[PDB]
Paper text:
Using the rose-form crystals, we obtained two different structures of the O state: under the proton-pumping (pH 8.4) and pumping-inhibited (pH 4.6) conditions at the 1.4- and 1.09-Å resolutions, respectively. We will refer to these structures as the O* and O states for clarity. At the same time, the extracellular part of MAR turns into an almost fully dehydrated region because of the FG-loop closure (a key role in this process is the formation of a hinge in helix F). It can be concluded that the structural and spectroscopic data of the rose form of MAR allow assigning this state to the late O intermediate. Apparently, the O state is trapped by the crystallization conditions in the rose-colored crystals. Fortunately, the O intermediate state of PRs harbors a retinylidene Schiff base with an all-trans retinal, allowing it to be trapped in the dark under certain crystallization conditions. Compared to the structures of the ground, M-like, and N states, in the O state structure, an additional water molecule w6 is incorporated in the HBC between Glu83 and the carbonyl group of Lys200. Glu83 and w6 acquire two conformations. In the first conformation, Glu83 makes an H-bond with Ser41 and w6. w6 is stabilized by Ser41 and w5. In the second conformation, both Glu83 and w6 break their bonds with Ser41. Unexpectedly, the His-Asp pair remains protonated in both O* and O state structures, as indicated by the H-bond (2.7 and 2.6 Å, respectively) between the residues.
Author numbering: 1 to 217
The structure:
């Protein structure tokens, strides 16, 4: 398990870089007015690339720092919401949701960090899990309600974005609890890594697809 976890960190590092530069190279495929989300998706993968290089080194040392993962999350999750909410909102409605969902994400990630750095299975560990889970469910319920009025190819492309988040983000609470299900500390890190690749590279691909649709392709 320890070597598998290291290898996955190394592969994910190159994968985040590939996502970054793939998305940048692909921006010419859509109209200028629809490139912003693609560029933000590239920024998300680029920040992740930076932190994945650090996480692989940290894991390899034998004294791993989950703070690297959590700082990456706290910076990137609000950016992902910026991309999502721009599809359905502008102006006042956009500003309100970006702020409120960003605050919620920060609470979720901070509660998780508090719990994960507590003794596994302790009241503190479960306190962080429960607070994070409630905030997560609030976010997912808000997301489900977004764009329910859309029709046509834009509706389908937005539903694909929503579904990636609604399904893919379940991996994170599963990773968080893995170490109390078995001798699975490394499996937490495996699951977080797989999740970050799926969610960050996948969202970028789907934001690019949305931009193709918005461009009339
Ligand atoms: C790019 C990274 C992403 C999208 C990270 C997402 C992280 C989460 C949705 C984390 C959620 C958690 C819970 C719902 C409960 C346990 C604590 C967390 C922070 C792992
Ligand atoms: C036109 C295509 C735009 C891509 C520009 C990306 C360059 C900046 C990346 C960071 C260095
Ligand atoms: C018309 C404007 C075109 C320029 C947009 C370029 C935006 C690229 C942003 C992503 C680059 C990320 C590079 C790695 C980040 C390192 C984190 C520290
Ligand atoms: C130690 C006592 C706490 C055990 C119960 C925590 C389970 C929470 C599941 C959500
Ligand atoms: C913080 C624990 C309760 C979970 C529900 C989250 C409430 C909404 C987030 C505040 C931003 C407005
Ligand atoms: C551990 C593996 C977990 C797999 C999660 C799969 C994520 C679901 C993505 C939803 C599909 C949206 C893509 C639309 C096609 C374009
Ligand atoms: C126990 C909660 C998970 C139910 C199945 C959905 C998991 C999807 C992971 C991708
Ligand atoms: C150990 C008890 C905790 C329950 C596991 C929850 C895992 C996350 C699933 C949330 C999906 C909604
Ligand atoms: C963990 C194994 C990965 C296999 C499932 C990949 C999930 C696809 C994510 C959807 C975005 C790309 C659309 C095609
Ligand atoms: C354009 C084709 C891009 C395919 C990438 C889809 C995979 C998403 C990340 C998980 C693997």
């Amino acid at each position: 398990m320890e070597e598998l976890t290291y290898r996955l960190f190394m592969v994910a590092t190159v994968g985040m870089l590939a996502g970054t530069v793939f998305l940048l190279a692909s921006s010419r495929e859509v109209k200028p007015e629809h490139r912003r989300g693609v560029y933000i998706s590239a920024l998300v993968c680029g920040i992740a690339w930076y932190h994945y290089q650090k996480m692989g080194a940290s894991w390899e040392s034998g004294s791993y720092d989950t703070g690297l993962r959590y700082v990456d999350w706290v910076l990137t999750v609000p950016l992902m919401f910026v991309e999502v909410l721009a599809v359905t909102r502008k102006g006042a409605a956009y500003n309100e949701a970006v702020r409120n969902w960003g605050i919620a994400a920060t609470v979720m990630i901070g509660a998780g960090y508090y719990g994960e750095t507590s003794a596994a299975g302790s009241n503190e560990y479960w306190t962080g899990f429960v607070i994070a889970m409630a905030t997560y469910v609030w976010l997912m319920r808000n997301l489900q309600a977004e764009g329910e009025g859309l029709k046509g190819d834009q509706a389908v492309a937005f539903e694909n974005i929503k579904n990636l988040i609604l399904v893919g983000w379940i991996i994170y609470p599963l990773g968080y609890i893995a170490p109390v299900v078995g001798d699975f500390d490394a499996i937490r890190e495996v699951l977080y890594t797989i999740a970050d690749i799926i969610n960050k590279v996948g969202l970028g691909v789907l934001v690019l697809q949305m931009a193709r649709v918005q461009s009339g392709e």
